[PDB]
A paper describes a structure:
Death-associated protein kinase ([name]) is a member of the Ca2+/calmodulin-regulated family of serine/threonine protein kinases. The role of the kinase activity of [name] in eukaryotic cell apoptosis and the ability of bioavailable [name] inhibitors to rescue neuronal death after brain injury have made it a drug-discovery target for neurodegenerative disorders. The three [name] conformations demonstrate that nucleotide binding brings about changes in conformation that are mostly localized to the glycine-rich loop region. The most notable conformational changes occur in the glycine-rich loop region, an active-site region with potential for modulation of kinase activity.
In this alternative conformation, the phosphate is in a similar location to the position where Mg2+ binds. This raises the possibility that the role of Mg2+ is to assist in the selection of a catalytically preferred conformation of the β-­phosphate.
Numbering used by the authors: 2 to 52, 54 to 108, 110 to 277, 291 to 294
The structure:
């Protein structure tokens, strides 16, 4: 599929840089015709078949998935442009920064943690209902609308690894960040929606303790720890955390994805119910 090939600068003015990645830069922008503000994500295209940059197939998948999405806890896609060097996604602007940077700024109370977590679970419930595995859930990829309110609203971002799972598993290894990937990712096994639920367990552990449960001194050591389910609840961090909070995490950090809580399970859980190489 092809995208709008007019000069994006004819229709938008760009401002501050919001973030960077592996083959992408994200800049604040403003649409001339409406005055409304967005985040423009410039994704570098492949220069040759083999090659740096993102394959066209990968970009088209990300765009397809983004076009399906509309939910308060997920980013939305406004428009897509392209030229010879970049595909440019005009995304909904999320102005309150990453949950990652919020966590560095403030460890949270259980209430603060569950307020974020309920929103994350609602967003993932929506995605999984559409058979979309995000495959890159981590605090960097959960943005706040406004960081200066007592109960910030969040949106899930970064659909660069997301896949539609039409058979209950998919086989291509979709390897994210070692600290957050499930054992089946580490072991290059078929992957499904269950992989996101593991990442949610890791996120929850971090929200409650300020510490990463599998992190080693090298990426390879992290991956080994993940495959062996080498984590524990350090008394120093968790001695006054409720046993139900620990129960929630335990039921997500399970090696066998068939035995791991589903997104629907996580919403009925009593605590809730009201790149890889060195
Ligand atoms: N919609 C948005 N609103 C505000 N900031 C964003 C938005 N999308 C991305 N960012 C910022 O840019 C960074 C990189 O975005 P990302 O989608 O991860 O690109 P990459 O393909 O490089 O990983 C994010 O971690 C975040 O800081």
């Amino acid at each position: 599929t092809v995208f709008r090939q007019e000069n994006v600068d004819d229709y938008y003015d760009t401002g501050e840089e919001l973030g960077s990645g592996q083959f992408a830069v994200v800049k604040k922008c403003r649409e001339k015709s409406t005055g409304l503000q967005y985040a423009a994500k410039f994704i570098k295209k492949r220069r040759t078949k083999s090659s740096r940059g993102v394959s066209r197939e990968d970009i088209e998948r990300e765009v397809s998935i983004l076009k399906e999405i509309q939910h308060p806890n997920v980013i939305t896609l406004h428009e897509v442009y392209e030229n010879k060097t970049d595909v440019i996604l005009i995304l909904e602007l999320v102005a309150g920064g990453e949950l990652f940077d919020f966590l560095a700024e403030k460890s949270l109370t259980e209430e603060e943690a569950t307020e974020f977590l309920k929103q994350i679970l609602n967003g993932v419930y929506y995605l999984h209902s559409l058979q979309i595995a995000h495959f890159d859930l981590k605090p960097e990829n959960i943005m706040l609308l406004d960081r200066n309110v007592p109960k910030p609203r969040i949106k899930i971002i970064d659909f660069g690894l997301a896949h539609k799972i039409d058979f209950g598993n998919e086989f291509k290894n979709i390897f994210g960040t070692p600290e957050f990937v499930a054992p089946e990712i580490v072991n290059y096994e078929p992957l499904g929606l269950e992989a996101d639920m593991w990442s949610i367990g890791v996120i929850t552990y971090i929200l409650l303790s300020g510490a990463s449960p599998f992190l080693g001194d090298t990426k390879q050591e992290t991956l080994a720890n993940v495959s062996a389910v080498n984590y524990e609840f350090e008394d120093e961090y968790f001695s006054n955390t409720s046993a139900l909070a620990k129960d929630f995490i335990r039921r997500l950090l399970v090696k066998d994805p068939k035995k791991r809580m589903t997104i629907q399970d996580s919403l009925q859980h009593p605590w809730i119910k009201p790149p890889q190489f060195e």
